[PDB]
Amino acid sequence: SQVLKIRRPDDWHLHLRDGDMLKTVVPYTSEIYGRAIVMPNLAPPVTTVEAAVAYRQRILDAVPAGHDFTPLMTCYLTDSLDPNELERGFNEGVFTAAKLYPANATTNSSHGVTSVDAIMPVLERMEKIGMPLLVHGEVTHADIDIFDREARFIESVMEPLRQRLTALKVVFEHITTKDAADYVRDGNERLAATITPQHLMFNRNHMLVGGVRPHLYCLPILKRNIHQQALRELVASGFNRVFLGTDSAPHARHRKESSCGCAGCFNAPTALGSYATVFEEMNALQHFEAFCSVNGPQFYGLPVNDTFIELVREEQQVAESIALTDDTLVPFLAGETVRWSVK
Amino acid sequence: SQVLKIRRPDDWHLHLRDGDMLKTVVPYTSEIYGRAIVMPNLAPPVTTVEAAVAYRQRILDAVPAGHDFTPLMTCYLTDSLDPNELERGFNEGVFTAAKLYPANATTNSSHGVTSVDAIMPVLERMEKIGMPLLVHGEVTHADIDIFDREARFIESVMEPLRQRLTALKVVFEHITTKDAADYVRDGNERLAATITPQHLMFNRNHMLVGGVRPHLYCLPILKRNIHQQALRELVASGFNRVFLGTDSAPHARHRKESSCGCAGCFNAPTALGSYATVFEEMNALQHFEAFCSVNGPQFYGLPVNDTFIELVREEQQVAESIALTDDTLVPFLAGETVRWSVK
Ligand SMILES: NC(=O)N[C@@H](CC(=O)O)C(=O)O
Ligand SMILES: O=C1C[C@@H](C(=O)O)NC(=O)N1
Ligand SMILES: [Zn+2]
Ligand SMILES: [Zn+2]
Ligand SMILES: [Zn+2]
Numbered sequence: 001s002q003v004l005k006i007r008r009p010d011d012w013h014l015h016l017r018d019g020d021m022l023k024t025v026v027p028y029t030s031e032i033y034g035r036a037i038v039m040p041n042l043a044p045p046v047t048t049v050e051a052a053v054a055y056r057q058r059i060l061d062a063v064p065a066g067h068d069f070t071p072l073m074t075c076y077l078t079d080s081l082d083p084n085e086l087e088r089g090f091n092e093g094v095f096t097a098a099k100l101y102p103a104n105a106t107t108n109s110s111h112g113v114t115s116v117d118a119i120m121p122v123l124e125r126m127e128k129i130g131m132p133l134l135v136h137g138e139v140t141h142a143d144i145d146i147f148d149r150e151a152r153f154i155e156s157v158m159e160p161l162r163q164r165l166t167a168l169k170v171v172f173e174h175i176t177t178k179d180a181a182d183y184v185r186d187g188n189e190r191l192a193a194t195i196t197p198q199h200l201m202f203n204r205n206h207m208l209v210g211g212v213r214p215h216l217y218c219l220p221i222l223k224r225n226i227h228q229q230a231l232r233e234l235v236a237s238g239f240n241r242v243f244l245g246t247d248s249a250p251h252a253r254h255r256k257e258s259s260c261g262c263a264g265c266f267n268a269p270t271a272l273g274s275y276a277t278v279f280e281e282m283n284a285l286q287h288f289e290a291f292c293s294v295n296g297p298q299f300y301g302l303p304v305n306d307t308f309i310e311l312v313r314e315e316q317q318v319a320e321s322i323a324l325t326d327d328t329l330v331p332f333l334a335g336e337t338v339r340w341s342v343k
Numbered sequence: 344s345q346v347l348k349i350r351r352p353d354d355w356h357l358h359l360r361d362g363d364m365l366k367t368v369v370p371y372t373s374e375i376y377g378r379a380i381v382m383p384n385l386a387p388p389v390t391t392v393e394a395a396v397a398y399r400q401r402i403l404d405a406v407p408a409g410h411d412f413t414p415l416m417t418c419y420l421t422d423s424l425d426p427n428e429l430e431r432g433f434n435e436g437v438f439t440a441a442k443l444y445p446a447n448a449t450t451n452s453s454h455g456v457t458s459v460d461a462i463m464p465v466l467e468r469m470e471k472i473g474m475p476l477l478v479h480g481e482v483t484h485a486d487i488d489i490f491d492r493e494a495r496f497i498e499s500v501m502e503p504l505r506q507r508l509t510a511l512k513v514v515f516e517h518i519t520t521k522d523a524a525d526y527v528r529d530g531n532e533r534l535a536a537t538i539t540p541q542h543l544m545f546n547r548n549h550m551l552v553g554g555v556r557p558h559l560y561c562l563p564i565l566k567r568n569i570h571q572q573a574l575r576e577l578v579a580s581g582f583n584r585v586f587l588g589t590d591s592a593p594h595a596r597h598r599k600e601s602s603c604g605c606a607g608c609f610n611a612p613t614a615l616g617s618y619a620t621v622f623e624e625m626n627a628l629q630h631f632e633a634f635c636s637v638n639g640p641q642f643y644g645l646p647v648n649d650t651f652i653e654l655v656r657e658e659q660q661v662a663e664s665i666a667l668t669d670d671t672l673v674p675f676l677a678g679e680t681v682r683w684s685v686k
């Protein structure tokens with residue numbers, strides 16, 4: 001019965017993959033979101049303007065006619081990346097931002113960054129030109145417990161980095177901890193964050209109690225409930241430098257359900273409604289539109305979308321699976337109900 | 344090529360399942376172990392003398408000709424269990440011990456326990472007749488973080504129980520925490536524990552870093568490294584009330600590698616060599632025999648085995664999988680090179 005009309009949202013953290021997977025997954029984004037930050041961790045990674053242009057066009061090809069969707073491309077930072085390549089791409093309107101993957105921290109990160117020190121010239125060029133840095137903020141040393149890797153990044157990498165480049169704009173991507181939430185809440189106007197639906201809706205119990213649920217396995221790893229509650233309070237507070245970033249990260253069913261399941265939730269179909277439910281539960285729906293449709297554009301210095309969509313509080317059952325060329329794709333919340341759906 | 348000769352070991356915590364799965368897995372135990380504690384969590388659970396007698400016969404039917412193997416049966420404790428049935432089974436030599444699984448108010452009275460308080464008559468009967476209680480020591484409350492559930496059990500259930508029943512012999516099964524290692528270390532002669540190979544060899548990073556690994560998913564859940572080290576230190580100390588209990592807990596591959604993977608490591612084929620590897624690494628091979636072959640018997644008041652077994656330090660490959668009637672079974676350490684194997 002109840003209806004929320006919002007300014008059309010954007011997705012400030014998205015994985016679209018490539019080839020046939022891309023053809024399948026883009027419509028779920030393009031039918032709802034005006035723009036999306038398309039992450040660059042392909043194999044091989046997007047590290048040049050040329051690759052970004054070609055990838056952008058492959059994305060455009062797969063967008064149904066009538067969807068007004070623009071992909072905002074990113075550069076995959078590497079230790080040896082030429083600052084001139086980054087800047088050329090930024091100047092041509094190709095790269096909207098650059099993404100920092102610590103080497104081996106996540107999906108397709110074996111070519112990632114080894115030290116902040118090795119990429120200083122690139123980061124100084126980004127600071128100079130006003131290009132935002134998107135950060136997957138986890139340390140990677142093998143002996144550091146997986147649940148501590150986010151918190152340990154803040155003090156060992158993030159804070160030193162930001163002290164060294166005081167004008168650098170940084171998005172702490174997909175935060176999962178009270179540690180990061182506090183850090184961001186207490187930061188300056190040059191620091192922001194994105195938060196996924198899964199890190200708002202669930203904690204590690206939901207992935208591990210009663211059975212192991214690979215479709216909830218994603219990075220940074222789901223944390224203890226105290227952390228989940230901290231993220232929920234952050235978004236519900238109206239804090240205006242947190243915004244929607246799904247981290248929709250699809251893998252074929254049998255790459256999830258295997259002896260070594262890949263990290264990532266395919267939440268593009270259900271993210272917006274799921275976010276609606278969280279804001280509602282936190283009695284903070286007055287802050288919902290800003291999170292979805294205003295805070296991101298503001299941080300990125302981009303206009304807000306000029307169209308509007310409607311969410312209705314009618315219960316929508318989520319598909320058990322989505323067809324791929326080979327295998328199927330299991331949506332986040334598969335077989336489940338979502339409280340809010342798009343009109 | 345180094346040889347390690349020990350009195351024939353026993354397995355003080357084993358799942359043998361039933362039907363065709365039982366037929367497949369029993370040989371991996373019976374070729375090596377003289378005796379094993381056979382847990383009672385069948386569907387439906389073993390809660391009567393008659394069920395236990397029938398199950399023992401089915402186990403015996405599946406032992407290859409020549410293997411000298413004796414299953415030691417257990418009763419699953421339930422709200423509805425008649426303490427007379429339990430005592431009769433104990434007196435008739437059918438029940439070696441009784442197993443207490445975590446309480447839950449919603450459990451059916453024929454399939455489990457709603458609270459420890461609810462089954463005092465039966466526990467008093469065990470204390471009376473000198474029947475050992477085997478405890479899966481976790482609390483199940485949805486509000487408790489999965490990694491905290493063992494520690495919470497010690498505080499809220501184990502200690503008050505052992506306070507109310509001072510003559511009760513208790514095995515803290517498959518301990519996974521420093522909390523439990525300390526508790527057991529500091530307890531009296533009526534308190535012992537078993538430790539699995541996976542909880543000595545790995546911690547939660549091995550299950551979750553670089554992919555989700557359902558064949559390392561088991562209960563109690565793998566803990567952070569500080570807990571692993573406490574367990575390794577405990578067995579290496581020579582403390583004589585910890586002993587071998589594999590918790591070998593087989594599930595078909597498709598039940599492990601699913602959207603909701605079952606908890607349990609099938610480690611019967613590789614457990615003994617794995618324990619040898621751990622004791623060697625801890626420079627504690629002088630305590631290895633006692634762990635495998637002496638401590639359990641002493642605690643249960645049974646004789647030590649009179650035959651011997653040899654492990655040789657020659658590298659060997661663990662099978663990738665083991666055929667079942669339908670599907671396959673993936674062993675603990677599948678496809679890996681292993682350091683110690685049985686001659
Ligand atoms: N989050 C994930 O678990 N997976 C993402 C990578 C990322 O955002 O780190 C992916 O691309 O698969
Ligand atoms: O407590 C248990 C039960 C066992 C089983 O599968 O029977 N599996 C486990 O991992 N832990
Ligand atoms: Zn990431
Ligand atoms: Zn991502
Ligand atoms: Zn158990």
Ligand SMILES: [Zn+2]
Pocket residue numbers: 356357358382590592
């Ligand atoms: Zn068990």
